[PDB]
Structures are given as structure tokens and as C-alpha cells.
Design a protein around this motif. Sequence first.
Motif, PDB file in Angstrom:
ATOM      1  N   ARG A 152      52.747  53.631   3.547  1.00  0.00           N
ATOM      2  CA  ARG A 152      51.301  53.296   3.085  1.00  0.00           C
ATOM      3  C   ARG A 152      50.149  54.131   3.413  1.00  0.00           C
ATOM      4  O   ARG A 152      50.395  54.486   4.905  1.00  0.00           O
ATOM      5  CB  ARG A 152      51.183  51.681   3.187  1.00  0.00           C
ATOM      6  CG  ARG A 152      50.919  51.347   4.508  1.00  0.00           C
ATOM      7  CD  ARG A 152      52.726  50.650   5.313  1.00  0.00           C
ATOM      8  NE  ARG A 152      52.230  49.895   6.762  1.00  0.00           N
ATOM      9  CZ  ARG A 152      52.736  49.198   6.735  1.00  0.00           C
ATOM     10  NH1 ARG A 152      52.628  48.524   5.927  1.00  0.00           N
ATOM     11  NH2 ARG A 152      52.273  48.915   8.775  1.00  0.00           N
ATOM     12  N   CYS A 157      46.874  58.289  16.563  1.00  0.00           N
ATOM     13  CA  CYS A 157      48.606  58.774  17.265  1.00  0.00           C
ATOM     14  C   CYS A 157      48.792  57.403  15.962  1.00  0.00           C
ATOM     15  O   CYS A 157      48.971  56.443  15.836  1.00  0.00           O
ATOM     16  CB  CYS A 157      48.750  57.640  18.305  1.00  0.00           C
ATOM     17  SG  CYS A 157      47.623  56.907  18.824  1.00  0.00           S
ATOM     18  N   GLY A 158      50.361  58.264  15.397  1.00  0.00           N
ATOM     19  CA  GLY A 158      51.461  57.015  14.433  1.00  0.00           C
ATOM     20  C   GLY A 158      50.777  57.569  13.201  1.00  0.00           C
ATOM     21  O   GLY A 158      51.510  56.321  11.745  1.00  0.00           O
ATOM     22  N   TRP A 159      49.791  58.095  12.626  1.00  0.00           N
ATOM     23  CA  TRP A 159      49.673  58.293  11.165  1.00  0.00           C
ATOM     24  C   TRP A 159      49.895  59.327  10.867  1.00  0.00           C
ATOM     25  O   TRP A 159      49.792  60.474  11.718  1.00  0.00           O
ATOM     26  CB  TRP A 159      47.771  57.239  11.221  1.00  0.00           C
ATOM     27  CG  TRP A 159      47.843  56.152  11.470  1.00  0.00           C
ATOM     28  CD1 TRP A 159      47.368  55.389  12.747  1.00  0.00           C
ATOM     29  CD2 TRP A 159      48.219  55.381  10.570  1.00  0.00           C
ATOM     30  NE1 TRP A 159      48.287  54.126  12.599  1.00  0.00           N
ATOM     31  CE2 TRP A 159      48.356  53.976  11.548  1.00  0.00           C
ATOM     32  CE3 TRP A 159      48.458  54.605   9.256  1.00  0.00           C
ATOM     33  CZ2 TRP A 159      48.395  52.567  10.835  1.00  0.00           C
ATOM     34  CZ3 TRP A 159      49.155  53.649   8.548  1.00  0.00           C
ATOM     35  CH2 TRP A 159      48.897  52.427   9.192  1.00  0.00           C
ATOM     36  N   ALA A 161      55.681  46.020  19.635  1.00  0.00           N
ATOM     37  CA  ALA A 161      55.622  46.844  20.404  1.00  0.00           C
ATOM     38  C   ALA A 161      54.507  45.797  21.042  1.00  0.00           C
ATOM     39  O   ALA A 161      53.647  46.454  22.665  1.00  0.00           O
ATOM     40  CB  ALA A 161      54.824  48.032  19.283  1.00  0.00           C
ATOM     41  N   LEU A 204      58.392  54.306  20.281  1.00  0.00           N
ATOM     42  CA  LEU A 204      58.745  52.896  19.986  1.00  0.00           C
ATOM     43  C   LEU A 204      59.883  54.227  18.615  1.00  0.00           C
ATOM     44  O   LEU A 204      59.288  54.600  18.269  1.00  0.00           O
ATOM     45  CB  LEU A 204      57.816  52.268  19.723  1.00  0.00           C
ATOM     46  CG  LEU A 204      56.552  51.865  19.947  1.00  0.00           C
ATOM     47  CD1 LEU A 204      55.752  51.507  19.350  1.00  0.00           C
ATOM     48  CD2 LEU A 204      56.910  51.744  21.427  1.00  0.00           C
ATOM     49  N   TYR A 238      54.781  42.693  15.212  1.00  0.00           N
ATOM     50  CA  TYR A 238      54.908  43.639  15.745  1.00  0.00           C
ATOM     51  C   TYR A 238      55.126  43.968  16.673  1.00  0.00           C
ATOM     52  O   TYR A 238      54.186  43.450  17.367  1.00  0.00           O
ATOM     53  CB  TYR A 238      53.657  45.005  15.293  1.00  0.00           C
ATOM     54  CG  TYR A 238      53.131  45.344  13.933  1.00  0.00           C
ATOM     55  CD1 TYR A 238      52.500  45.071  13.139  1.00  0.00           C
ATOM     56  CD2 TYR A 238      53.368  46.659  13.671  1.00  0.00           C
ATOM     57  CE1 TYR A 238      52.381  44.895  11.959  1.00  0.00           C
ATOM     58  CE2 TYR A 238      53.769  47.292  12.210  1.00  0.00           C
ATOM     59  CZ  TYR A 238      52.875  46.818  11.172  1.00  0.00           C
ATOM     60  OH  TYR A 238      52.808  46.591  10.579  1.00  0.00           O
ATOM     61  N   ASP A 284      60.836  47.010  14.982  1.00  0.00           N
ATOM     62  CA  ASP A 284      60.547  48.440  15.608  1.00  0.00           C
ATOM     63  C   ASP A 284      60.731  48.137  17.618  1.00  0.00           C
ATOM     64  O   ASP A 284      61.294  46.433  18.011  1.00  0.00           O
ATOM     65  CB  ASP A 284      58.842  48.266  16.252  1.00  0.00           C
ATOM     66  CG  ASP A 284      58.240  47.080  16.428  1.00  0.00           C
ATOM     67  OD1 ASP A 284      58.621  46.027  14.865  1.00  0.00           O
ATOM     68  OD2 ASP A 284      57.063  47.099  16.990  1.00  0.00           O
ATOM     69  N   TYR A 306      61.703  45.460   8.155  1.00  0.00           N
ATOM     70  CA  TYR A 306      60.655  46.090   9.289  1.00  0.00           C
ATOM     71  C   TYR A 306      61.264  46.397  10.966  1.00  0.00           C
ATOM     72  O   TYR A 306      60.183  44.810  10.492  1.00  0.00           O
ATOM     73  CB  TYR A 306      59.495  47.300   8.440  1.00  0.00           C
ATOM     74  CG  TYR A 306      58.995  48.134   8.663  1.00  0.00           C
ATOM     75  CD1 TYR A 306      59.159  48.976  10.073  1.00  0.00           C
ATOM     76  CD2 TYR A 306      57.144  48.215   8.903  1.00  0.00           C
ATOM     77  CE1 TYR A 306      58.562  50.179  10.412  1.00  0.00           C
ATOM     78  CE2 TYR A 306      56.806  49.039   9.684  1.00  0.00           C
ATOM     79  CZ  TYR A 306      57.248  50.509  10.372  1.00  0.00           C
ATOM     80  OH  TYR A 306      56.511  50.791  11.020  1.00  0.00           O
ATOM     81  N   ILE A 333      50.927  48.777  26.286  1.00  0.00           N
ATOM     82  CA  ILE A 333      50.647  48.527  25.030  1.00  0.00           C
ATOM     83  C   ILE A 333      48.886  47.583  25.969  1.00  0.00           C
ATOM     84  O   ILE A 333      49.203  46.208  26.425  1.00  0.00           O
ATOM     85  CB  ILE A 333      51.192  48.158  23.884  1.00  0.00           C
ATOM     86  CG1 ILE A 333      52.052  49.016  23.717  1.00  0.00           C
ATOM     87  CG2 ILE A 333      50.027  47.438  23.205  1.00  0.00           C
ATOM     88  CD1 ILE A 333      51.464  49.833  22.319  1.00  0.00           C
ATOM     89  N   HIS A 385      46.340  47.264  10.869  1.00  0.00           N
ATOM     90  CA  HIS A 385      47.801  47.859  10.193  1.00  0.00           C
ATOM     91  C   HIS A 385      47.962  47.021   8.649  1.00  0.00           C
ATOM     92  O   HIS A 385      47.052  45.646   8.968  1.00  0.00           O
ATOM     93  CB  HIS A 385      49.035  46.492  10.720  1.00  0.00           C
ATOM     94  CG  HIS A 385      49.845  48.259  11.586  1.00  0.00           C
ATOM     95  ND1 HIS A 385      49.563  48.382  12.925  1.00  0.00           N
ATOM     96  CD2 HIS A 385      50.907  49.306  11.122  1.00  0.00           C
ATOM     97  CE1 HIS A 385      49.606  49.593  12.936  1.00  0.00           C
ATOM     98  NE2 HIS A 385      51.270  49.891  12.355  1.00  0.00           N
TER      99      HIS A 385
HETATM  100  N1  FT6 Z   1      51.984  52.400  11.131  1.00  0.00           N
HETATM  101  C1  FT6 Z   1      53.534  52.189  11.483  1.00  0.00           C
HETATM  102  C2  FT6 Z   1      53.891  51.965  11.900  1.00  0.00           C
HETATM  103  C3  FT6 Z   1      52.815  52.285  13.691  1.00  0.00           C
HETATM  104  C4  FT6 Z   1      51.656  52.681  13.855  1.00  0.00           C
HETATM  105  N2  FT6 Z   1      51.585  52.954  15.034  1.00  0.00           N
HETATM  106  C5  FT6 Z   1      52.097  52.305  15.613  1.00  0.00           C
HETATM  107  C6  FT6 Z   1      52.442  50.451  17.109  1.00  0.00           C
HETATM  108  C7  FT6 Z   1      52.744  50.100  17.277  1.00  0.00           C
HETATM  109  F1  FT6 Z   1      52.791  50.011  18.237  1.00  0.00           F
HETATM  110  C8  FT6 Z   1      53.990  50.067  16.281  1.00  0.00           C
HETATM  111  C9  FT6 Z   1      53.995  50.131  15.928  1.00  0.00           C
HETATM  112  C10 FT6 Z   1      52.931  51.207  14.723  1.00  0.00           C
HETATM  113  C11 FT6 Z   1      53.633  51.157  10.156  1.00  0.00           C
HETATM  114  O1  FT6 Z   1      53.617  50.204  10.535  1.00  0.00           O
HETATM  115  O2  FT6 Z   1      53.257  51.960   9.320  1.00  0.00           O
END
Ligand code: FT6
Lengths: 417, 415
Positions: A63, A394-396, A144, A264, A142, A310, A308, A150, A162
Motif C-alpha cells: 500500500r 526507513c521501511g517504505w 515490533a 525485523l 504490530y 512481524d 500479516y 524501538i 500505518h
Molecule cells: N510499512 C510496512 C511494514 C513496516 C514498515 N515499518 C515498520 C516498522 C515496524 F516497527 C513494523 C512494521 C513496519 C507495512 O505494514 O506494510
Amino acid sequence: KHSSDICIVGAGISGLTCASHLLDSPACRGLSLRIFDMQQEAGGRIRSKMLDGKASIELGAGRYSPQLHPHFQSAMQHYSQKSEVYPFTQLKFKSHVQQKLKRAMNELSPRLKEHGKESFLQFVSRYQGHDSAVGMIRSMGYDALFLPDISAEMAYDIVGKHPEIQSVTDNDANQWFAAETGFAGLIQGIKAKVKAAGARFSLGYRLLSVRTDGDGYLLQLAGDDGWKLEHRTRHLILAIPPSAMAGLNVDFPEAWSGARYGSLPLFKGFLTYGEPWWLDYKLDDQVLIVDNPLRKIYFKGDKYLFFYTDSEMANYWRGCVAEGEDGYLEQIRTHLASALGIVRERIPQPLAHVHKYWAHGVEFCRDSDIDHPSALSHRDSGIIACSDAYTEHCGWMEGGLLSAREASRLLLQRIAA
Amino acid sequence: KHSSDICIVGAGISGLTCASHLLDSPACRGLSLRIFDMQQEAGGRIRSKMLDGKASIELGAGRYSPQLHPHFQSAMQHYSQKSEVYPFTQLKFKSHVQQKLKRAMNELSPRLKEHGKESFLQFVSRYQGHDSAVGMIRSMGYDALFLPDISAEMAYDIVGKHPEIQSVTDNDANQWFAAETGFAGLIQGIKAKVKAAGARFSLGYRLLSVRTDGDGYLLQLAGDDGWKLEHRTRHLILAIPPSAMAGLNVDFPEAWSGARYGSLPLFKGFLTYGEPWWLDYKLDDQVLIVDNPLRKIYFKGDKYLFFYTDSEMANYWRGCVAEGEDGYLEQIRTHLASALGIVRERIPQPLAHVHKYWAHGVEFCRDIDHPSALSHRDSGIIACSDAYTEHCGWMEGGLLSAREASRLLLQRIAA
Ligand SMILES: N[C@@H](Cc1c[nH]c2cc(F)ccc12)C(=O)O
Ligand SMILES: Cc1cc2nc3c(=O)[nH]c(=O)nc-3n(C[C@H](O)[C@H](O)[C@H](O)COP(=O)(O)OP(=O)(O)OC[C@H]3O[C@@H](n4cnc5c(N)ncnc54)[C@H](O)[C@@H]3O)c2cc1C
Ligand SMILES: Cc1cc2nc3c(=O)[nH]c(=O)nc-3n(C[C@H](O)[C@H](O)[C@H](O)COP(=O)(O)OP(=O)(O)OC[C@H]3O[C@@H](n4cnc5c(N)ncnc54)[C@H](O)[C@@H]3O)c2cc1C
Ligand SMILES: N[C@@H](Cc1c[nH]c2cc(F)ccc12)C(=O)O
Ligand SMILES: [Mg+2]
Ligand SMILES: [Mg+2]
């Protein structure tokens, strides 16, 4: 011989965007571009698959938001990829704690100046006890958010970005979109346009070591059928995430920046049915966030469902899947029943199903305000590193699009000077 | 994770047949059996594709002989696998040099008793000019015959065991067959038997290390998606080739046998076309052995052509692909033209095309007091491979080695 002016190792969205930029600048007319990727198809952590042949699913990235990812949305526009609306933006079934969650965070907002660098759970354990902090954090889906690396500042950010939980912060007005045909459609477009500009792709080769020989660099690769291979190049971008940079002779992260990094795991599993049975329960286009292992359950229309997870909960499913696939399917059926308050007999069995486990799904910078630029450079050897982790996102995917633009800047500087 | 009584690492025809012979046995009643393979599908060097939706091709093993390979045809009949005549058993368009083949090979054959341990090019260059030996050996299309490792005696056996050139040593008695649906049909047949009898499969997992622990062993494995994994077993067969064996921590080949092992790379490239143009040359179901880098060129009826090389030539082609699929297809089409004696512009370009390179295509025996399956001097791990048999490099070797290793492992179960 087997040589090139510019070599990009990494054909995810970071790499192929570094390729796209360099090609257009006439600083690179008649220069030779080779792209290597360890996998057999480009995309990296973008990975679209046709399940059963009936539908299109996203095993990796899924997304995006025009608020948070305008450079990605511009990309989807520029390559005529059609977007669709992403429904998973409100929880219809907010439990007691999800109710309380909203208020419970506007109120510790002040104390983030004082103690905002604690762990997120250390932080919240001061509102009510440890045992109420956990119920609150668990209810967000989530895991994490339970880690020590964190921070409580990183945490208020993650939930604001999110879709399923954004309503708990003042980020509740952000729109979210997915791709019609899947993001691999974007990846192909960039690939095709980079190819016609004359970059040459060697997919299925994996870099092992790099050494400098004078004016350029000398790469040791090993193809996936075993074939060793070497490549002399004048300029090199390592468009690969930190976890991958650790495994080479490039002295990472010390020679590159001050930061330490982490990652993660993520797990997604999808299931298709004969009849779309969740329509009776008025569930198409809804997300439950549950305390049981599925943690986040999604019902896409009348097409499929998926979950989904993590961190620890992703490893737990990767374990279960290893112990054979019928006990994995039967645990899913059990937990789908708990979340719907029904008994497992009313949950059919599926036809098809696929799952994906990403060892290093999200990689992130562990140090805030250490002055992190979009792309890195090896201080000694002058190699450019390029990855979404090196950025504010970060993570996108957006973080890939931005690291790449910087990374293609510092390259051209090394050419014209 | 968890554990198993018997663990097999390898799901080629060796490992899958071991699993068969064991679950057949009454001594294994109740016992649990786990199979591991690093690839996602079973077969090892048996791989059948069905390319351009119109024909089944073989990227590894492609032919068997009922005469040379009796257990394999039993296994084919045993699993109700249809066969078909392998067409490429002679050369219709021989050159000048490849009739001097039968008359010089069958005449240099008395000299094999004096110079037997000698390498093949040393041999045939003693009874003819050196440049006349390089023209005579290279006329046979298998570039493994130019190597010091392979001797002049170990060379007369390769010539008589391969279907394109066996005429050269009086062995046209042998017949050659392929599978109608390809050999994966066999592999699926055995696999279904072993699954139906309760063995649990774990494909995509790759063994990195073993360590003993009393009555059993503890194995480190890594999924191809990174997922590390630990598995304990009480008895363990490593049904993998010796190149794979050396890649572990298990004193190979020392703690196992007084033998060394080498390997040759192989390469096959397949090409399909819109119109089957090579018919206009009476080339269907024919094979041309040529000097140029294609070496051996095959025309399957009116469906596809392919070419098959080994050793350096195999590395020639693997390198060519590495520098881009365009350089490769134009190379093929140049050499194709020189082989037919025509201009480049008459070779059409292909629609679909696939190729495979086998870094260790054939694994052979460096020696001859040799058992069919190895046992560890100390730990009792059993190794199973076609490389431990008289039939170094044929599916038949994997069937023989499988039988042997089952029996050693059953002897370690009982008593
Ligand atoms: N953004 C991603 C997953 C994600 C991106 N950053 C993080 C940080 C985190 F601590 C957990 C998941 C994520 C998603 O959900 O589609
Ligand atoms: C489950 C999941 C869901 C996600 N959902 C979203 C989302 O909804 N929105 C969003 O913005 N982002 C999402 N992401 C993140 C997004 O996928 C990534 O940030 C983005 O794809 C990363 O781009 P990249 O090119 O930097 O990384 P990558 O895609 O990881 O590219 C790395 C490439 O380098 C190759 N490579 C690596 N290493 C080596 C080596 N040593 N030698 C040779 N080659 C090599 C790899 O094969 C890979 O192709 C998600 C990620 C996951 C795992
Ligand atoms: C191009 C080519 C053509 C051939 N043509 C013929 C022919 O016409 N007739 C004929 O009889 N033979 C032919 N062969 C040979 C035949 O394919 C082999 O003899 C036979 O298939 C090998 O059987 P195997 O089970 O012992 O091992 P393999 O087929 O090599 O299987 C070994 C298995 O062990 C697995 N493995 C290895 N290592 C590890 C690890 N660390 N962890 C986990 N798993 C692991 C591999 O994935 C593989 O599945 C040909 C071979 C090639 C390459
Ligand atoms: N000749 C077999 C395989 C084979 C077995 N031993 C050898 C030796 C060699 F030098 C080449 C191939 C082989 C084939 O048709 O592929
Ligand atoms: Mg990349
Ligand atoms: Mg095997």
C-alpha cells in the motif's frame, strides 16, 4: 572485456531508480551501465503474484499514501500504473482497549520531551501498569512495538504511518492506495525504460566481494548455477539494504556512517476459498486486529483473505510452516474462529494458499539525530550505498525513491569532478 | 523444530530410491522418515521442462539403454512410465574424418594393453600425428576426451556407452530410449510412493553442517528464504554427489574411502522456432557432430533443436550467456550457419529458448576396489551417489548406490 563504466548492484526500487536517474543526465551519454541482482527477477521486496490465476496479491510491499509517499505516487503516475483505493483504514470492531487507545495516547504526548527516548513499552508502563501497557500495545497489531530498540518516539511515528491504526494519532486523515495490477507493474515499467536506455541486466548473479584496482572497482560475483564471474567497473552503487552490506569486505557500517542498524522479519499468508464465506458476516474490506497469532486479518472483497505479522510472531509462523503445511492450515482455521466468535466447523477449508517470510522485511536506522543523509559513501574507497533504511522513510518504498535520488547525485559529482 | 528416526538429505533418484527401499522394509514399520532437498522440486539432475506449451524437453538426463541400464528400465516399467525410441543413434551427414573413426579406433585397439593408464590424447597421438589425433578425437563431440584425468582405457568405455558414437566401437547392439513425458514422471512416481507411505518432505532446505550426538545426529539446515533450522535424526543418508559432500564438515573424501573425485561441467541450450526450418535439409531426428563450439547439434523431429557440450566448451557457453543473451543467440546462429554450410541470414531467429549449465554435471571415480555406497569411518553416516559405482554418471548408478545404502542402513537398524 567484461567491464562497465557504472555498475548498480541491486535491482529493487532503489537500484532501478538510481538507474533511471543516471540514464537521463547527459553526463552519462555513451557510458556503460550494468545492473546485477542476486534474484532472477527485479523487484526485491516488491513481489506481485497471481494466486489461483483469479486475483493479484502483494507478497511484499502492498500500500501507499499520497500524504506520506508523494514521490511514489508521482512514479505510479509517470509510468501510467493505475491505483485503487485501499479499504483497510479503519477497524470496524474496536475492542475496549482500542477504544481507550485513541485517548490514551493524546495524553502522554507531552511527556515525550522528557522521556521520549525510552522504549515504547517502558514509556507506556507509566500511564497504567505494565499489564495495561501490554494490552494497549498488543491491541495495535504490530509486535515490533514491544522491542527495546524501538524508542517511544519511533513508536508514535510508526503507528501514525500505518493505515490500520493511524486513527489513533492526528494522522487519521491520510488516504491509502494499492496497485490494480500489482506493484510489479511499476517495476516492469522502470526495468523496460532502463533497458531501452541501454542498461544491461545480469539477473541471477550475487556479489561476494569488492576490491579497488586504481581508477575503478573489481567485483567478484557468483551466479546462481555456481558460475563464478568478475567485473571491472569505474563507478559502483550498492543498492542493497544494510543486512546485505554486512556480508562483504566493505567494512560496513564503520567505514560508511556512525549508525548501527537492525531489521525485523515479516510474514504474510494468503488463502483462497470456493465460496467467499465472510460476506455473510459483513466482512469484505475489513481488518480485525486480534490478540491471537494471526494478529492482523484482512478480507479483500470476495477474493481472498490474508494475515500479516512481524517479529516474534513472524518467526512463529515461519516455524509452524516448517513443521509441515497441514498443521499450519489447521492453526489458521482455529484462530480465524476465535476472531469471529464462531466454531471452526463454520470455516471452510481453502483451495489454494501461499505465504512469504521475509527474514529482513523492514530495516531501519537505530540512531535518531546522528545526521543521516539519504545515501552513504565509503569514506576511503568512494562507493555509494543506497537503500530505504538510510532515510526518514526507513521501511517504505518512498525511502527507496529518495535514497536513489541522492545516490545518483553523489555519483554524478564523482564523474564531473 | 523436531526430529525423525531416519533422515535422507537429497531428493534425486538416489535419495528417493533409498526412501523407497527403506519404507518397503518391515524393519522400518512405525519409524518416521524426513527428506531434505535444497531445490524446491525433486529430481536433482533430472529436470524436464515443457517449453512453449508444445513439447517436453530434458535439461539433464535424457536417455537410457535397456542393455547397459537394466535396473532403470525395471524402474520405468515398475512405475508404469511409457518410453519411446531415442532417435539420435547415428550420423547421417558424416564428414571426411568420422569414417576414419571406426577403421582407426578398431585398429588402434590392440595397443590398449601396453598404454592403458595413459591419457587418451597421449595414446591416439602415438599412432597418428598430433594434429591428426586432435582432429580424430574432436570429431566425436565430447570434449572430456582431451583431459589428462581421463585415460585411454577409461576413454574407450565412454565412446561405447554414448548413443551418438557407439558405432565407433562395435556396440550398435545397444538401444536407446527416452521418456514420453520426460523423466520427472519417474521422479514423481517414486515420490508419490514415498509420500503415500508416510515420509515427510522438506524441500527448499539446505544442509550446512552435521554433528554426532550419541545414538543419532544433529543437522543444521537453512531455508532458501533464510529460515535457519535444526533437525535431529538417529540414522542419516546423505544422498548427494561428492562435490556437495566436500562442502560440509565431514572429512571428505578421507574418512570415507581411498578415492578421489572430479567433475565435468555440462551445458545444454534449447531453441524453438515459428516454422521448423531445418526440415528443408532432411535434418529431422538427426544429429551433427561439428568442429565449431556447438559441438553436438540435435534436431527433434519438427519441434525444437538443441545443442549439448561439456568441459571447456560448456564453460565457453556459460560465459557467453553471462555477457548477455543477445551475444549468445547470435553466436549460436553463426555457428549454426557454419555447420550447415550456409549464410547467416538464412538461420531464422528463435521465439523461445532455454538453457541450463551444470557446474558439476558428471561426477566420476578417480581410480578400483570400490563399494557401491560409502560409510563414515567413525560416525556411520551413509553416502549414496552414482559416483560410487561402475556406472559413474548415469541414473543407473544412482539406483545401484541407493540399493546398497538402504541395506547398510537396515543392517544398522537391526542388530
Ligand atoms: N510499512 C510496512 C511494514 C513496516 C514498515 N515499518 C515498520 C516498522 C515496524 F516497527 C513494523 C512494521 C513496519 C507495512 O505494514 O506494510
Ligand atoms: C512484507 C512487506 C510489506 C511491505 N509493505 C510496504 C508498503 O505497503 N509500503 C511501502 O512503502 N513499503 C513496503 N515495504 C518495504 C518496501 O518493499 C521496501 O522498502 C522497498 O522495496 C525497498 O527497496 P530497496 O530497493 O531499497 O530494497 P530491496 O527491494 O530489498 O532491493 C534489494 C535488492 O538487492 C538484491 N540484492 C541484495 N543483495 C545482494 C548481493 N549481496 N549481491 C547481489 N545482489 C543483491 C536483492 O535481490 C534485492 O533484489 C514492505 C516490505 C515487506 C517485506
Ligand atoms: C546434462 C546432463 C545430462 C545427463 N544425461 C543422462 C542420461 O542421458 N542418462 C543417465 O543415466 N544420466 C544422465 N545424467 C546423470 C543423471 O542425471 C545423474 O546420474 C543422476 O540424476 C544423479 O542422481 P543422484 O540422485 O545421485 O544425485 P542428484 O541428481 O545430483 O541429486 C542430488 C540431490 O542432492 C541435493 N543436494 C545437494 N546438496 C545438498 C545440501 N547441502 N542440502 C540439501 N540438499 C542437497 C540436490 O538438490 C539434489 O536434489 C545427466 C546429467 C546431466 C547433468
Ligand atoms: N554421456 C552421458 C553422461 C555421461 C556419463 N559419463 C560421461 C562422461 C563424459 F565425458 C561425458 C558425458 C558422460 C550423456 O549422454 O549425457
Ligand atoms: Mg535496489
Ligand atoms: Mg539423490
